[PDB]
Scaffold this motif. Structure first.
Motif, PDB file in Angstrom:
ATOM      1  N   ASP A 180       0.841  -1.185   0.000  1.00  0.00           N
ATOM      2  CA  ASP A 180       0.000   0.000   0.000  1.00  0.00           C
ATOM      3  C   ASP A 180       0.885   1.248   0.000  1.00  0.00           C
ATOM      4  N   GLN A 181       0.308   2.343  -0.473  1.00  0.00           N
ATOM      5  CA  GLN A 181       1.030   3.602  -0.532  1.00  0.00           C
ATOM      6  C   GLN A 181       1.815   3.827   0.762  1.00  0.00           C
ATOM      7  N   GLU A 182       1.311   3.229   1.832  1.00  0.00           N
ATOM      8  CA  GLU A 182       1.951   3.355   3.131  1.00  0.00           C
ATOM      9  C   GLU A 182       3.161   2.423   3.218  1.00  0.00           C
ATOM     10  N   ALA A 183       2.945   1.184   2.800  1.00  0.00           N
ATOM     11  CA  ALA A 183       4.004   0.190   2.826  1.00  0.00           C
ATOM     12  C   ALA A 183       5.164   0.664   1.948  1.00  0.00           C
ATOM     13  N   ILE A 184       4.807   1.183   0.783  1.00  0.00           N
ATOM     14  CA  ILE A 184       5.804   1.674  -0.154  1.00  0.00           C
ATOM     15  C   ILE A 184       6.600   2.806   0.501  1.00  0.00           C
ATOM     16  N   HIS A 185       5.872   3.679   1.183  1.00  0.00           N
ATOM     17  CA  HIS A 185       6.495   4.806   1.857  1.00  0.00           C
ATOM     18  C   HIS A 185       7.538   4.295   2.854  1.00  0.00           C
ATOM     19  N   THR A 186       7.176   3.224   3.544  1.00  0.00           N
ATOM     20  CA  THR A 186       8.067   2.630   4.526  1.00  0.00           C
ATOM     21  C   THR A 186       9.284   2.012   3.836  1.00  0.00           C
ATOM     22  N   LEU A 187       9.034   1.432   2.671  1.00  0.00           N
ATOM     23  CA  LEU A 187      10.096   0.804   1.905  1.00  0.00           C
ATOM     24  C   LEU A 187      11.022   1.885   1.344  1.00  0.00           C
ATOM     25  N   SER A 188      10.412   2.990   0.939  1.00  0.00           N
ATOM     26  CA  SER A 188      11.167   4.100   0.383  1.00  0.00           C
ATOM     27  C   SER A 188      11.918   4.831   1.498  1.00  0.00           C
ATOM     28  N   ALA A 189      11.512   4.549   2.726  1.00  0.00           N
ATOM     29  CA  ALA A 189      12.135   5.169   3.882  1.00  0.00           C
ATOM     30  C   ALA A 189      13.159   4.205   4.484  1.00  0.00           C
ATOM     31  N   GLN A 190      12.646   3.115   5.035  1.00  0.00           N
ATOM     32  CA  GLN A 190      13.501   2.111   5.645  1.00  0.00           C
ATOM     33  C   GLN A 190      14.742   1.876   4.782  1.00  0.00           C
ATOM     34  N   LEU A 191      14.508   1.771   3.482  1.00  0.00           N
ATOM     35  CA  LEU A 191      15.593   1.546   2.543  1.00  0.00           C
ATOM     36  C   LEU A 191      16.122   2.894   2.049  1.00  0.00           C
ATOM     37  N   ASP A 192      15.230   3.874   2.031  1.00  0.00           N
ATOM     38  CA  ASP A 192      15.592   5.208   1.586  1.00  0.00           C
ATOM     39  C   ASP A 192      15.570   5.255   0.057  1.00  0.00           C
ATOM     40  N   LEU A 193      14.824   4.324  -0.521  1.00  0.00           N
ATOM     41  CA  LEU A 193      14.709   4.249  -1.967  1.00  0.00           C
ATOM     42  C   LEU A 193      13.448   4.990  -2.414  1.00  0.00           C
ATOM     43  N   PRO A 194      13.403   5.302  -3.737  1.00  0.00           N
ATOM     44  CA  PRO A 194      12.264   6.007  -4.301  1.00  0.00           C
ATOM     45  C   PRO A 194      11.059   5.075  -4.445  1.00  0.00           C
ATOM     46  N   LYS A 195       9.888   5.686  -4.549  1.00  0.00           N
ATOM     47  CA  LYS A 195       8.658   4.926  -4.692  1.00  0.00           C
ATOM     48  C   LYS A 195       8.695   4.144  -6.007  1.00  0.00           C
ATOM     49  N   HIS A 196       8.955   4.872  -7.083  1.00  0.00           N
ATOM     50  CA  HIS A 196       9.021   4.263  -8.400  1.00  0.00           C
ATOM     51  C   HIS A 196       9.917   3.023  -8.348  1.00  0.00           C
ATOM     52  N   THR A 197      11.076   3.195  -7.729  1.00  0.00           N
ATOM     53  CA  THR A 197      12.026   2.103  -7.604  1.00  0.00           C
ATOM     54  C   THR A 197      11.361   0.890  -6.949  1.00  0.00           C
ATOM     55  N   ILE A 198      10.897   1.098  -5.727  1.00  0.00           N
ATOM     56  CA  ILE A 198      10.241   0.035  -4.984  1.00  0.00           C
ATOM     57  C   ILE A 198       9.101  -0.540  -5.826  1.00  0.00           C
ATOM     58  N   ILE A 199       8.290   0.360  -6.361  1.00  0.00           N
ATOM     59  CA  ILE A 199       7.164  -0.043  -7.186  1.00  0.00           C
ATOM     60  C   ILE A 199       7.667  -0.901  -8.347  1.00  0.00           C
ATOM     61  N   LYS A 200       8.523  -0.298  -9.159  1.00  0.00           N
ATOM     62  CA  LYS A 200       9.084  -0.993 -10.305  1.00  0.00           C
ATOM     63  C   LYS A 200       9.497  -2.405  -9.888  1.00  0.00           C
ATOM     64  N   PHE A 201      10.532  -2.465  -9.062  1.00  0.00           N
ATOM     65  CA  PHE A 201      11.034  -3.742  -8.584  1.00  0.00           C
ATOM     66  C   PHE A 201       9.886  -4.721  -8.326  1.00  0.00           C
ATOM     67  N   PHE A 202       8.953  -4.282  -7.494  1.00  0.00           N
ATOM     68  CA  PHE A 202       7.803  -5.105  -7.157  1.00  0.00           C
ATOM     69  C   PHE A 202       7.136  -5.658  -8.418  1.00  0.00           C
ATOM     70  N   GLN A 203       6.804  -4.746  -9.321  1.00  0.00           N
ATOM     71  CA  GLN A 203       6.162  -5.128 -10.568  1.00  0.00           C
ATOM     72  C   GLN A 203       6.799  -6.403 -11.124  1.00  0.00           C
ATOM     73  N   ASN A 204       8.119  -6.458 -11.028  1.00  0.00           N
ATOM     74  CA  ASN A 204       8.858  -7.610 -11.515  1.00  0.00           C
ATOM     75  C   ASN A 204       8.365  -8.868 -10.796  1.00  0.00           C
ATOM     76  N   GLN A 205       8.291  -8.766  -9.477  1.00  0.00           N
ATOM     77  CA  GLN A 205       7.839  -9.884  -8.665  1.00  0.00           C
ATOM     78  C   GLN A 205       6.464 -10.359  -9.136  1.00  0.00           C
ATOM     79  N   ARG A 206       5.583  -9.395  -9.357  1.00  0.00           N
ATOM     80  CA  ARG A 206       4.236  -9.701  -9.807  1.00  0.00           C
ATOM     81  C   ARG A 206       4.277 -10.394 -11.170  1.00  0.00           C
TER      82      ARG A 206
END
Length: 71
Positions: free
Chosen positions: A34-60
């Motif tokens: 969720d936009q929240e989880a992504i935010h945490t991923l973009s924070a905890q990791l300090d990575l961008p949303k697109h990045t996290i999102i993109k990467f994920f897309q791959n998993q999907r």
């Protein structure tokens, strides 16, 4: 819940940790961040949303044969 979004192109470089981290959350939550989880991923990791999102897309994209409900 329910939502989706396309995302062409792919290119990332995660040392490992960060990746692994979020990875753990993926195997925990699943494949519906969720936009929240992504935010945490973009924070905890300090990575961008697109990045996290993109990467994920791959998993999907990969996940197809195996779905929900074990077995």
């Amino acid at each position: 819940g329910s939502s989706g979004s396309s995302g062409p192109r792919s290119r990332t470089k995660i040392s490992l940790e960060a990746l692994g981290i979020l990875q753990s959350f993926i195997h925990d939550v699943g494949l519906y961040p969720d936009q929240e989880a992504i935010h945490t991923l973009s924070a905890q990791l300090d990575l961008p949303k697109h990045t996290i999102i993109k990467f994920f897309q791959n998993q999907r994209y990969h996940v197809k044969h195996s779905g929900p409900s074990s077995g």
